[PDB]
Amino acid sequence: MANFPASLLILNGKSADNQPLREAITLLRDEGIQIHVRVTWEKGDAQRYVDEARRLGVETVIAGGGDGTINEVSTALIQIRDGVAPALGLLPLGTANDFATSAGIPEALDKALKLAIAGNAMEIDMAMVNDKTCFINMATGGFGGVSYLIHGLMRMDTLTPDRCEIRGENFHWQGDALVIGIGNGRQAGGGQQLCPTALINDGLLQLRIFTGEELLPALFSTLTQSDDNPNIIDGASAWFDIHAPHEITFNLDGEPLSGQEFHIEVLPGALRCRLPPDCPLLR
Amino acid sequence: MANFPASLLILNGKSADNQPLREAITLLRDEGIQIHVRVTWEKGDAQRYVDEARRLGVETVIAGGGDGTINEVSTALIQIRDGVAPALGLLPLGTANDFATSAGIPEALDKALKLAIAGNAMEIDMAMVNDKTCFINMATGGFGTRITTLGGVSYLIHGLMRMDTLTPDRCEIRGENFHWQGDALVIGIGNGRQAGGGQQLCPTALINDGLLQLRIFTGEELLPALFSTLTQSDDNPNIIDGASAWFDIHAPHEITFNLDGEPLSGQEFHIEVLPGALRCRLPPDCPLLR
Ligand SMILES: [Ca+2]
Ligand SMILES: [Ca+2]
Ligand SMILES: [Ca+2]
Ligand SMILES: [Ca+2]
Ligand SMILES: [Ca+2]
Ligand SMILES: [Cl-]
Ligand code: NA
């Protein structure tokens, strides 16, 4: 049990009846291991249980669910408070598991629980948008069958390039953009690689601008072709300022955000997270 | 026919009084080497002497001048279908000599003259645009306003490109697997790598790959991007690179191009490489060779 600090588990209602997990937890609770369990029903709950988690003094808050749940927990975990925030643990259960997957967290439910409770925690970055919202994995923006891939990666339907200005460290670009990709992580919308170089502990944010009228084929392209594609502009910076005369809307790991101005900054080592010793996203 | 096949030097008038050159030629002519000399005065002469070089059965026609002179000779040489045309020889003369420079030919006349005569020949490319004008080195185009009625980036813009003020404008560009559209400031399409005295527009370019290199500069300024390293360039969002055997340029608002000096305006440009269209005597360690 010394190898298993206490832990509160925030579980998405969509898995509230997942028996195999119930059994795994029951076993662990048998060795004197403390594992609290809470289940969310809507947005806002995660925050509530992370707060109880702090009060309970647990060392780990495990997010059980998809990227949306990881984001809500992580967000609540970086909230400026009194005392040392618990570390973040990952238990992939949602349909959308991009971050968890990209980070290399075990498929085996029981094997992921061990990592989330016993694993060592590495400090990692986080992106903040307009000082109000956050995201740990990916932000994608655009203006306005294979449609499922377009709507699966974003709340968009039929994209159209519109004008927007973008600034960052040693970076200034302007023109018509179809899709703006800013990642802390590397993939989104179910396996689609967008910022293949991203590292979650470098203090940077990978930017990827897709120009032109087409997009899907670029997506199915190799890393060699995408590099020769004049309609793909890569960038990297701790921050980015986006200005779009016509309202652009981003998708922050599931949560929509619209507007004409976006300030995006990395919050270096904002939270600890139990990742495998050889995580692909780690410097 | 030997270590020094007979050659015919096409000396651009502006350098007819060069004493050192005359001194070199004379010494080689003493050693039994045969070097015919013809000096141009205006457009058309180069072609007239290339025809004469043919009748004299020389194995090399040496362009004694800048990129402009090299173009005139190459363009005439490229038109020879009857058997084997003479190889192109290079000299470091003329105001604008970016090609010879980038090719790494000797700065010393006596040395460069010997390479131009005895050096080995290699098949190289040439670009042709709109079925009328060719170029062996670089084609640059700028959007904005032409010069209306001396050095560095200022020379390239106001001098070579003969531009008053550069101002981004819309243009559409197509290539084998290339299709970009948007506001552009300056377009560089080269068979060679530099123009305007040193300015490296298409650093990767090779003269025997059967491809052309494209560099699109976007954004409001040109100077800063021109002083970037080979890396800052690959990371510059306003610099776009492309390679293709051909390129179609469409500029809604008449764009002005510059093919090794001679201008060619219009709103439509088709550029295509002519793979190994000519042989050119080059030094073994030539940076432009694949
Ligand atoms: Ca604190
Ligand atoms: Ca990062
Ligand atoms: Ca690219
Ligand atoms: Ca070439
Ligand atoms: Ca670039
Ligand atoms: Cl979820
Ligand atoms: Na030259």
DSSP secondary structure, chain B, as one string: --SS--EEEEEEGGGTT-HHHHHHHHHHHHTT--EEEEEE-STTHHHHHHHHHHHTT-SEEEEESSHHHHHHHHHHHTT--SS-PPEEEE-S-SS--HHHHHHT--SSHHHHHHHHHHSPEEEE--EEETTTEEESSEEEEE-EEE-----HHHIIIIIIS-EEEE--EEEEEEETTEEEEEEESEEEEESSSEETTTEESSTT--TTSS-EEEEEE-SS-SHHHHT--HHHHHH-TTEEEEEESEEEEEEEEEEEEEETTEEEEEEEEEEEE-TT-EEEE--TT-TT--
Task: Tell whether A226 is within 8 A of chain B (Cβ).
Answer: no
Q: What are the angstrom distances between the C-alpha of B5 and each of B12, B90, B231, B244, B281?
A: 22, 15, 44, 36, 12
Task: Tell whether B238 is within 8 A of chain A (Cβ).
Answer: yes
Q: Do B183 and A173 touch (CB under 8 A)?
A: no
Q: How many CB pairs under 8 A join A and B?
A: 36
Picking from B177, B178, B183, the nearest residue to A175 by CB comes out as B183
Q: Are A136 and A214 in contact (CB under 8 A)?
A: no
* Position A246, amino acid: H
CATH architecture for segment(s) B2-125+276-282: 3-Layer(aba) Sandwich (3.40)
Q: Which of A178, A229, A241 best tests the B interface by mutation, with the highest count of B CBs <10 A?
A: A229
Torsion from C-alpha of B52, B56, B58, B60, nearest 10 degrees: -10
Picking from A171, A228, A231, the nearest residue to B237 by CB comes out as A171
Picking from A176, A230, A234, the nearest residue to B240 by CB comes out as A230
What resolution in angstroms does the PDB record give? 2.5
Q: Which residues of B touch A180 (CB under 8 A)?
A: none
Rounded distance from Cα B206 to ligand 4 centre (Å): 5
Q: What are the angstrom distances between the C-alpha of B204 and each of A88, B125, B193, B289?
A: 47, 15, 7, 11
Task: Tell whether B56 is within 8 A of chain A (Cβ).
Answer: no
Which class is A2-125+269-275 in CATH?
Answer: alpha beta
Rounded distance from Cα B8 to ligand 2 centre (Å): 64
Domain edges within chain A: 2-125+269-275, 127-268
Burial class of A5 by CB neighbour count within 10 A (0 to 12, 13 to 18, 19+)? middle
Rounded distance from Cα B165 to ligand 6 centre (Å): 55
Smallest CA–CA distance from A207 into chain B, residue: B237
C-alpha B198/C-alpha B138 separation (Å) is 12
Q: Which two tokens stand for residue B15?
A: 């350098």
- Residue of A185, A201, A192 whose CA lies nearest to A252: A185
Task: Tell whether B240 is within 8 A of chain A (Cβ).
Answer: yes
Q: Do A174 and B219 touch (CB under 8 A)?
A: yes
Q: Do A230 and B216 touch (CB under 8 A)?
A: yes
Q: Do B237 and A176 touch (CB under 8 A)?
A: no
Q: Which residues of B touch A211 (CB under 8 A)?
A: 180, 182
- Residue of A155, A149, A137 whose CA lies nearest to A63: A137
Three-state secondary structure of B96-156: CCHHHHHHCCCCCHHHHHHHHHHCCEEEECCEEECCCEEECCEEEEECEEECCCCCHHHHH
Q: Which residues of B touch A208 (CB under 8 A)?
A: none
CATH architecture for segment(s) B127-275: Sandwich (2.60)
Instruction: Identify the nearest ligand to the CA of B71 by its number.
Output: 7
Q: Which residues of A touch B178 (CB under 8 A)?
A: 230
- Between CA B254 and CA B259, with CA B257 as vertex, the angle to 5 degrees is 155
Q: Do B182 and A228 touch (CB under 8 A)?
A: no
Q: Which two tokens stand for residue B239?
A: 């610099």
Task: Tell whether B183 is within 8 A of chain A (Cβ).
Answer: yes
C-alpha B69/C-alpha B75 separation (Å) is 10
Which class is A127-268 in CATH?
Answer: mainly beta
Q: Which two tokens stand for residue B203?
A: 């650093």
Q: Is B167 annotated as a binding residue?
A: no
Smallest CA–CA distance from B214 into chain A, residue: A230
Method: X-ray
C-alpha A80/C-alpha A39 separation (Å) is 24
**Of the residues B52, B172, B262, B272, which is catalytic?**
B262
Task: Please state, as a whole number, how many other Cβ atoms lie within 10 Å of the Cβ of residue A27.
Answer: 12
Is A255 known to be catalytic?
yes
Task: Tell whether A145 is within 8 A of chain B (Cβ).
Answer: no
Smallest CA–CA distance from B216 into chain A, residue: A230
Q: Do B180 and A228 touch (CB under 8 A)?
A: no
Three-state secondary structure of chain A: CCCCCCEEEEEEHHHCCCHHHHHHHHHHHHCCCCEEEEEECCCCHHHHHHHHHHHHCCCEEEEEECHHHHHHHHHHHHCCCCCCCCEEEEEECCCCCHHHHHCCCCCCHHHHHHHHHHCCEEEECCEEECCCEEECCEEEEECCCCHHHHHHHCCCCCCCCEEEEEEECCEEEEEEECEEEEECCCEECCCEECCCCCCCCCCCEEEEEECCCCCHHHHHCCHHHHHHCCCEEEEEECEEEEEEEEEEEEEECCEEEEEEEEEEEECCCCEEEECCCCCCCCC
Task: Tell whether B218 is within 8 A of chain A (Cβ).
Answer: yes
Smallest CA–CA distance from A177 into chain B, residue: B182
Picking from B180, B183, B235, the nearest residue to A230 by CB comes out as B180
Q: What are the angstrom distances between the C-alpha of B155 and each of B51, B127, B195, B274?
A: 35, 24, 10, 29
Q: What are the angstrom distances between the C-alpha of A145 and each of A149, A157, A218?
A: 9, 12, 17
Task: Tell whether B228 is within 8 A of chain A (Cβ).
Answer: no
